Amino acid sequence: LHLKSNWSDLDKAKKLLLAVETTVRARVTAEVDKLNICDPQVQVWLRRVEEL
Amino acid sequence: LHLKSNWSDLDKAKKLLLAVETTVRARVTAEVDKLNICDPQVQVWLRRVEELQLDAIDEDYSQLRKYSCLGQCTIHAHRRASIGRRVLEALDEANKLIEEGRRFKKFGFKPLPKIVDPLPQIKTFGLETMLSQLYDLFEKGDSNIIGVWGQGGVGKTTLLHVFNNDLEKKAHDYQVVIFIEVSNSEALNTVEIQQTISERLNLPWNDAEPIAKRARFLIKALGR
Amino acid sequence: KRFVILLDDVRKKFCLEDVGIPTPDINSQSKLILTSRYREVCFQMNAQRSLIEMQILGNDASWELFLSKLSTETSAAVEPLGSQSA
Numbered sequence: 001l002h003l004k005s006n007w008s009d010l011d012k013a014k015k016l017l018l019a020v021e022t023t024v025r026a027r028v029t030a031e032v033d034k035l036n037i038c039d040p041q042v043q044v045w046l047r048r049v050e051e052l
Numbered sequence: 053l054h055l056k057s058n059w060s061d062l063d064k065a066k067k068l069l070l071a072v073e074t075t076v077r078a079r080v081t082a083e084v085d086k087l088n089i090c091d092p093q094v095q096v097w098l099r100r101v102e103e104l105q106l107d108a109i110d111e112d113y114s115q116l117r118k119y120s121c122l123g124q125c126t127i128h129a130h131r132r133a134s135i136g137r138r139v140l141e142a143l144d145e146a147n148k149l150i151e152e153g154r155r156f157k158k159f160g161f162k163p164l165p166k167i168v169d170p171l172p173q174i175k176t177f178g179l180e181t182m183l184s185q186l187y188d189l190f191e192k193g194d195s196n197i198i199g200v201w202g203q204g205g206v207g208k209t210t211l212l213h214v215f216n217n218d219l220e221k222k223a224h225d226y227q228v229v230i231f232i233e234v235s236n237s238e239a240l241n242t243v244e245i246q247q248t249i250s251e252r253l254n255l256p257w258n259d260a261e262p263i264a265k266r267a268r269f270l271i272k273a274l275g276r
Numbered sequence: 277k278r279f280v281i282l283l284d285d286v287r288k289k290f291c292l293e294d295v296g297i298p299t300p301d302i303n304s305q306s307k308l309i310l311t312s313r314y315r316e317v318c319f320q321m322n323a324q325r326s327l328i329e330m331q332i333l334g335n336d337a338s339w340e341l342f343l344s345k346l347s348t349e350t351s352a353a354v355e356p357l358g359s360q361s362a
């Protein structure tokens with residue numbers, strides 16, 4: 001039964017993705033504090049993650 | 053018979069995983085001691101390791117070993133498939149955890165500076181009325197600049213300390229609270245004040261930057 | 277952290293925050309023990325109601341300590357009891 005295993009893998013993926021989003025958001029906020037506009041590619045990545 | 057060999061491999065995996073967890077926990081504690089919050093990815097890895105609960109499969113294998121006296125006794129042979137699957141799942145999960153853990157290099161990140169930085173809390177006496185007046189001017193005041201004056205040595209800096217520590221409790225829309233001591237000089241030591249503002253704004257302090265340029269940069273930064 | 281800091285032989289009042297030591301309060305579990313030769317220094321550091329006077333040793337303890345600073349050649353002529361010698 002690959003459904004339960006795949007859903008557990010999806011859960012681990014959600015946790016890892018949340019961690020990566022937290023790290024990237026922290027760095028983006030650090031860059032914004034220096035009055036630097038966030039990189040558009042990082043903005044696209046954040047938009048894709050938020051729309052998951 | 054791959055079951056005994058695989059269980060021995062699982063035991064070696066538990067020992068190696070415990071070693072890796074000890075090393076990563078030591079480094080994470082070292083980073084926390086520096087007031088750096090643990091890296092979220094390392095937190096996720098630690099959460100996965102803590103939930104591996106290999107002792108459950110170990111106790112199940114012990115229970116099977118209670119009945120593992122004869123191989124021809126196919127009465128208990130049905131449980132072999134459950135053990136034969138859970139052992140391999142535990143083994144490859146542990147090896148994946150090992151590979152992820154060994155590759156970690158950054159274990160913490162500097163958290164964003166808090167809204168209100170705590171300041172010494174001296175036991176006050178009868179400051180409630182002055183605090184109430186200052187809060188009234190702070191909230192309902194139509195003028196953005198508030199001046200507090202009094203005789204030398206009469207509760208001023210203490211009033212500022214208590215007000216700053218009290219801003220923590222109440223809800224407010226003020227993002228950053230900065231405490232600046234211009235008292236350090238009558239010559240207006242600008243470098244010290246700019247350093248304090250930059251440190252409280254998470255800005256990268258520069259040494260060779262001209263004073264006027266840093267002033268303009270801080271004006272732009274605090275204007276947002 | 278809950279810290280126990282043993283300041284040793286303070287001789288002038290000094291601000292704990294300036295050096296970097298936070299002054300513990302009742303809301304915190306940390307204890308700060310400091311020693312000084314002067315009652316004024318202890319009072320100036322807000323320790324007025326937890327002050328201990330270091331009493332000098334008693335006669336028996338004094339004598340026991342004094343023997344430990346003597347060689348066996350000399351301790352043999354001082355330690356014995358029962359018989360009294362100058």
Ligand SMILES: Nc1ncnc2c1ncn2[C@@H]1O[C@H](COP(=O)(O)OP(=O)(O)OP(=O)(O)O)[C@@H](O)[C@H]1O
Binds near residue numbers: 176
């Ligand atoms: N309500 C209070 N209860 C107890 N002590 C107080 C109170 N208000 C002020 N103090 C004491 O006043 C002393 C001087 O600090 P304070 O903040 O009042 O100075 P100040 O008037 O701002 O001084 P300066 O003009 O030199 O900067 C401190 O040691 C503090 O303990």
